[PDB]
Amino acid sequence: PQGFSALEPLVDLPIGINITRFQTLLALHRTAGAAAY
Amino acid sequence: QSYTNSFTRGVYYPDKVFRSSVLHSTHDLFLPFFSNVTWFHDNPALPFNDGVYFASTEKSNIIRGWIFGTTLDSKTQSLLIVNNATNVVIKVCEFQFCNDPFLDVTFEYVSQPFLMKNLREFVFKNIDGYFKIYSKHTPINLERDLPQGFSALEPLVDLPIGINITRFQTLLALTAGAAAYYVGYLQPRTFLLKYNENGTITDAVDCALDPLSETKCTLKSFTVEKGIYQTSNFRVQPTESIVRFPNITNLCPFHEVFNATTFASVYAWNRKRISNCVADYSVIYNFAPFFAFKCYGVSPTKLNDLCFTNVYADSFVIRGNEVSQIAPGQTGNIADYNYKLPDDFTGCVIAWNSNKLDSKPSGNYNYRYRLLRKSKLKPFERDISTEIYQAGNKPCNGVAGPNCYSPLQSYGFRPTYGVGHQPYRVVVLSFELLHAPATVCGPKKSTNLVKNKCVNFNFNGLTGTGVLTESNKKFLPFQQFGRDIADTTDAVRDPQTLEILDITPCSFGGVSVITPGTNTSNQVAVLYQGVNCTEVSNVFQTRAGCLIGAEYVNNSYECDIPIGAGICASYQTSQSIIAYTMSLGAENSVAYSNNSIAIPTNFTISVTTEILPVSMTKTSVDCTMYICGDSTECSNLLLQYGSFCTQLKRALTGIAVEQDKNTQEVFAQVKQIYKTPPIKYFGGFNFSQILPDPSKPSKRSPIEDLLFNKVTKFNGLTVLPPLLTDEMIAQYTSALLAGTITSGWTFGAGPALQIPFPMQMAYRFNGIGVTQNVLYENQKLIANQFNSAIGKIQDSLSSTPSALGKLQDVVNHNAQALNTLVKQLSSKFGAISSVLNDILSRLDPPEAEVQIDRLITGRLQSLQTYVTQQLIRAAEIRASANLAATKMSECVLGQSKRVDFCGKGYHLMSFPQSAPHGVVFLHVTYVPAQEKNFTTAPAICHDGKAHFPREGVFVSNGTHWFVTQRNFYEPQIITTDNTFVSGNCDVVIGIVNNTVYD
Ligand SMILES: *[C@@H]1O[C@H](CO)[C@@H](O)[C@H](O)[C@H]1NC(C)=O
Ligand SMILES: *[C@@H]1O[C@H](CO)[C@@H](O)[C@H](O)[C@H]1NC(C)=O
Ligand SMILES: *[C@@H]1O[C@H](CO)[C@@H](O)[C@H](O)[C@H]1NC(C)=O
Ligand SMILES: *[C@@H]1O[C@H](CO)[C@@H](O)[C@H](O)[C@H]1NC(C)=O
Ligand SMILES: *[C@@H]1O[C@H](CO)[C@@H](O)[C@H](O)[C@H]1NC(C)=O
Ligand SMILES: *[C@@H]1O[C@H](CO)[C@@H](O)[C@H](O)[C@H]1NC(C)=O
């Protein structure tokens, strides 16, 4: 949608690790699944 | 209990410098005027404090010297002074005092004895390793208290001993000791000292004594003129300090590392890593008393001050005597084969007995330790490998027996064992610090909240000072602070309870001292600017602030000392300074009517003075000499900054040429030089007060002489003389006056055309709307009024100095600037000393470069500030000079119809006069007087035709109708000569039937 929704902080973690890549996990049953993000 | 008023006593010479007829401000230890001084008469230890003022009038000389020893015994070095008749012998050497030190009568200084109705004033001080003694001996009239007056204390001796002097004792030489000596204690104070031409201090002023004294210090003058003076700032200090961190909740598993009911063994010591928890050691200290609790890195209390990201816990059970092996740098079986702490270990070793719990009668063989390893273990290592030790040179072949032994062997712990073999529980805590964010700390403390008071606050790591009140603002849940438009904190969320507290800055404001002249009185009033009277004699609240010492009076007077929003203070006369709402002026209601006019019946010739600055002092600055002086290193360093000196020189040269142009524009209006005739008769008009006086060599008029009497090197600073001398400006003024007197306004617009002065003044009367007959019929009266006004001008100028306040101001400002520019040569600007040669001599070149650079930056900034202020002042003076030139052209070389430009009234003529750096204009004006009420009509109806006056107005005395000029009542019979018809009778409103003759 075309509108302003200001995002609010939830969690700040003192992890201190360098992150270079990421991945999304999904609850798929090995049932068809299709999620779009 | 004898206590006396100190009066104005105890002022000494701060340093060795001589000063003549100057007022100097010093921040030094001193005896405050009118202070708490103890008159003494067994003898306890008197504290020396920072210093002591000892005033003894003891003629009997029961007091022989002083004991400044800090112990009055042989323990430490005691300073002992003897002031016998022979000599004063300051002794420091180690003396074995007798049981009763009194005579029947290393570091030694022998001098002439201090003693000679003598007032022995002594000041004893000890600063920067020097003990200073100041003395004064003055005759006193018959009095048992300190005399009223001023006495300066000359230095007497300095000692380089510089030892700690905490207590001082008056030496006893006989036991009833009744000695009449006053003792006061000195304080860090700011003083203002007035030196005479002889070099001595005649008087002094204590700044923090009273508001009038504060304003004397601020103005650096002992006499304060009438006015309001901003002196200091007023701030409400924080009463209490508040620290607020979040609810201590969550906590480190310290109750689990202990009380584990099983510690495994020491051959494989349990390693526990703890992080991200609230550190609380109350349970640790509340556990059983500890056989051995040694901390190697930090103090146990300061453990809470230091925050650690990683805390390592190692728990094991060892014998009693093996605890000593668990220490940095220890050699032993357990230390080298089971668990080795590093040489630089930082942690706490905690050990407590476990015989009550971990000892079994049958023998607890669970706990094991290693007693055969190939080599020593590296620090912080755990070796759990248990294979057949190969002590023999034959292969063990995986079996044991001959020369092949099991690496591990167990303790057998039984309760009957004595100390030294009983099982001890040891929990070694290890702390590690690595360069990453931490987020692991100890019980952050918190205090009770204080509201509606000026408090220091530290709310969740945000520090500040202010007044905390309740706030209507509603924060979002994740927010903590509130910040306003100027990026200043205005609200805070309390961590412990989620409450929005608004922060208000604590009350602060200027302090102004409303004073009459010091000549008139010494009473003062104090205005706290912008402060509510609750936050701070008679207290009054005004929009300006809070006024203390002035009483509000309902009646209104003309403003004398401005304060604020319509409030003025004055010394009207117990009766004292009063504050009132200023009166704008007398209320006058003009009797307006449809047919009422007021015509003047007489006139007043009024002469007024207008003083205008024209030029300012021309100054040239040598940038290199000011910044650097004779130092070549400073010049080389200055070359790097650029061409700043060239720009400053260009600006100052521009100002100087502009000043010359200003004087030329104002005074060089006429090219010819006109001379007044030797026979000085001008129809009864006496111009002696404005014309030059040939008797005195100056060739200046009496008014010019009065003005010159009233108004009337360094370091690269030079004052360049003006191009036109005072004599040349006098010649210009004489030429302008002679031209005005002889030629009227004709000399301004072309050739000078002679005209008798009465005719010129008649034409000026025509210029202001009054006929010539008025002047020619009233010539003697006009002449007498002009003469009286010119006579009064001299007295008005001489009696009131403020009339010449403009020109003098300019001079003062210039001097002040120069003084500042020189005074900042003595300022350090963050260097070692203001003297460049001292810095160069004491410090090596590489280190001296930074000090010289700081001095250069400070001095160059000072020069830039001076030049910018000079440019702004030059702009102001140029505006004033342009106004003066316009007035000279339009008021002196002509008659101006502009209102209030040339005097107040109807302008007739202006006379110029020269004053130091300016021009004084004597404006002659026509003021109507003695007005009379008449009935007036817009037109007169005769023969069915309207009639309007050609010049003037129709007036009636009640029965008869006349026509008269506006500015003078000269009634004339209405005739066709002074009227024009222009219309019929019906249109005009207010027409009056009457007769017009021919
Ligand atoms: C007094 O003091 C001086 C100072 O050294 C000393 O020479 C003299 O002998 C002393 N006289 C007495 C009274 O002991
Ligand atoms: C101080 O100076 C004045 C100058 O008139 C002089 O009369 C007086 O003797 C001086 N006081 C001294 C030298 O103690
Ligand atoms: C902290 O403890 C106090 C104790 O009364 C409680 O009122 C407060 O709500 C706690 N803090 C938070 C953020 O819940
Ligand atoms: C001073 O405080 C009082 C306290 O009620 C208040 O009424 C008054 O308005 C305050 N003065 C100013 C100028 O705000
Ligand atoms: C008004 O003026 C006339 C002169 O024309 C004089 O005779 C008369 O007395 C004056 N009286 C009044 C009404 O003022
Ligand atoms: C002036 O005279 C005319 C002539 O008739 C008359 O009508 C008028 O009323 C007179 N003026 C006044 C004010 O009466």
Swiss-Prot record, chain A:
Attaches the virion to the cell membrane by interacting with host receptor, initiating the infection. The major receptor is host ACE2. When S2/S2' has been cleaved, binding to the receptor triggers direct fusion at the cell membrane. When S2/S2' has not been cleaved, binding to the receptor results in internalization of the virus by endocytosis using host TFRC and GRM2 and leading to fusion of the virion membrane with the host endosomal membrane. Alternatively, may use NRP1/NRP2 and integrin as entry receptors. This is Spike protein S1. Glycans are attached at residue 18. The chain holds residues 217 to 265 of 1273 of the full protein. Binds to host ACE2. RBD also interacts with the N-linked glycan on 'Asn-90' of ACE2. Cleavage of S generates a polybasic C-terminal sequence on S1 that binds to host Neuropilin-1 (NRP1) and Neuropilin-2 (NRP2) receptors. Interacts with host integrin alpha-5/beta-1 (ITGA5:ITGB1) and with ACE2 in complex with integrin alpha-5/beta-1 (ITGA5:ITGB1). May interact via cytoplasmic c-terminus with M protein. May interact (via N-terminus) with host bilirubin and biliverdin, thereby preventing antibody binding to the SARS-CoV-2 spike NTD via an allosteric mechanism. The gene is S. Changing residue 18 to Q: Increased resistance to neutralizing antibodies.
